[PDB]
């Protein structure tokens, strides 16, 4: 549930991100998989060691998707209709594992851009990527 | 319980930390973001926008006092239990505030450590700050009854 | 999201809980409060003590909701509105505090009605509870 | 972590359980409530219905071996840690299975619990029995990394 100031304190931040989202990306993941490692159980197939092209390649889809997101969050539900089937149908990945990296990606901001990361844009970022896990966990039941 | 190499990366980023800029900055940020938080606060007056909690005075020295906890906290990290007994029984008798927004504010601190220190901030680093974290709101939500 | 299995099977057996609902209403307060300790941090004005009047007057006020979820399945956000309004905007209930009393319900319903809680009906009621707790929780910010 | 007074709740009604019919009821409604969890135990053969599930001669076999997992674990109460090691490994190495999921078959069994034993299984003696579920689940959790 997103505001006329929520949706524009992201835009603006995603703008000063610019083609440096894959890498963020990947950053993210790799603090999730380090600080919550239970979230590595849905990643068996994948080589998790450090700096790893794997998670790099995988970590560009992610910050893909969040481009994808912050074009359309009038109507994520629909943006986001192929990701939410993947998580919920496929991939079936718990809701609590979304709250893991959300909270890595906006650590993986603040990190990088100290300036743009104000409070109140940091709870923007919080609801908007509060949001995407929303839509993407919706189907679970 | 942490190790020797995981107290070296958090004792050593917090002998950087300043006590009063963090914590009024981690507190202020709680009540930002999560403002439903602001419902156990509400004698410190103008609450009212993101400006208002970010220079209330009354907000950065309870962030100071939150902050020196958790510096005790550090200083005995062997037995948090121990450390945070009678903060415990009063969050919960007292306050009535449940355990759950203790999550919040360590992921709150950790983002303000992540903005101050930047690089530094290692994902091993942070690994350690979430252990810690955890253990500290672990230590805060034993004596609820 | 349910179905149209779901909603017979919930339909069916709150048939069959009838004038019993508000009793059971309090018991599974009174079953989280013990297994849940943290859950009374929400009732500082309640005398919370064993077999009180103001937990089983609060009992038959949470089963007669349920009880207009279930003449309501089709349209949860609309019929629970006001509640919502009050458990997401002005009590501000952790959700996981709705997991403890669900699963503390389906508990109290074994108990009493072992015969109509089949492996069927016991999933179509979890199914339920949790999408009253999704609506409930809502407008958290 | 369990008081003596638990731990005769506990003890005397685990008593009283069959635990060959118990294991195959719990693991059969974990396969019907959450179905996700079918993705786990393809090998069993057919869960396309609660029917075929309740049925299923392998969900039955398995169900017995995690409910003797789980008897062993009441033997050694104040070290489940410890008793459930190598099956913390198991589950994290070789099954892939996010912990979450502990939760949600303990909270089955709990049901379960409660659909036998009716009346008899006391507000109290459910207390006791969430403390040994949330045990076992953390203790099976405790192995990840
Ligand atoms: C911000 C929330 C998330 C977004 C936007 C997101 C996005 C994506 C995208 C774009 C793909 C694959 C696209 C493709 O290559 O077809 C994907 C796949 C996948 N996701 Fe996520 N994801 C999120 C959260 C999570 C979480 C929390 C987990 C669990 C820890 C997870 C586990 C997986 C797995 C295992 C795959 C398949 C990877 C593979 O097999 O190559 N995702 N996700
Ligand atoms: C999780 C880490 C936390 C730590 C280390 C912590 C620490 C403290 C300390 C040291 C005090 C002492 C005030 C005094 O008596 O001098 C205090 C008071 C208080 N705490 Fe916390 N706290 C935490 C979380 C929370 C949360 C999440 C909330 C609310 C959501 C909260 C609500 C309060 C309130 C209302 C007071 C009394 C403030 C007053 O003086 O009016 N605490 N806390
Ligand atoms: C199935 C889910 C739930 C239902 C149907 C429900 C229903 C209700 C109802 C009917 C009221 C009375 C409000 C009115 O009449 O205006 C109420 C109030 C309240 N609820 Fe809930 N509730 C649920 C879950 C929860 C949970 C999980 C908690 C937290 C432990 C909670 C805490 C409260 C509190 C503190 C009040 C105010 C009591 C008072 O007026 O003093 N509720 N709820
Ligand atoms: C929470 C309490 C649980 C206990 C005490 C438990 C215990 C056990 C035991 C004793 C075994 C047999 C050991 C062996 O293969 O050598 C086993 C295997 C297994 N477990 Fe669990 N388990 C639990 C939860 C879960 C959950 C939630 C899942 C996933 C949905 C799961 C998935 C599996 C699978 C797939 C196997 C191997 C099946 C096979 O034998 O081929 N377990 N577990």
């Given at each position: ?141 | ?90 969050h919960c008798d007292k306050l009535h505030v449940d ?47």
């Open positions: 549930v997103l505001s006329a100031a929520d949706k524009s304190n992201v835009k603006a931040c995603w703008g000063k991100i610019g083609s440096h989202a894959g890498e963020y990306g990947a950053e993210a993941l790799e603090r999730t998989f380090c600080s919550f490692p239970t979230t590595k159980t849905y990643f068996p197939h994948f080589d998790l060691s450090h700096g790893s092209a794997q998670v790099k390649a995988h970590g560009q889809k992610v910050a893909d998707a969040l481009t994808q997101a912050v074009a359309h969050m009038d109507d994520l539900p629909t943006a986001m209709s192929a990701l939410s089937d993947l998580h919920a149908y496929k991939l079936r990945v718990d809701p609590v594992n979304f709250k893991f990296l959300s909270h890595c990606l906006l650590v993986t901001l603040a990190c990088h851009h100290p300036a743009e990361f104000t409070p109140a844009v940091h709870a923007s970022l919080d609801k908007f990527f509060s949001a995407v896990s929303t839509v993407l966990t919706s189907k679970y039941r | 319980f942490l190790t020797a190499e995981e107290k070296g990366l958090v004792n050593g980023l917090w002998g950087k930390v300043n006590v009063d800029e963090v914590g009024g900055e981690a507190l202020g940020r709680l009540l930002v973001v999560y403002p439903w938080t602001q419902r156990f606060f509400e004698s410190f007056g103008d609450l009212s926008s993101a400006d208002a909690i970010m220079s209330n005075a009354k907000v950065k020295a309870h962030g100071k006092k939150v902050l020196n906890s958790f510096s005790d906290g550090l200083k005995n990290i062997d037995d948090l239990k121990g450390a945070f007994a009678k903060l415990s029984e009063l355990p759950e927004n203790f999550r919040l504010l360590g992921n709150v601190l950790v983002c303000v450590l992540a903005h101050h220190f930047g690089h530094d901030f290692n994902p091993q680093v942070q690994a350690a700050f979430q252990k810690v974290v955890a253990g500290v709101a672990n230590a805060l939500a034993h004596k609820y009854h």
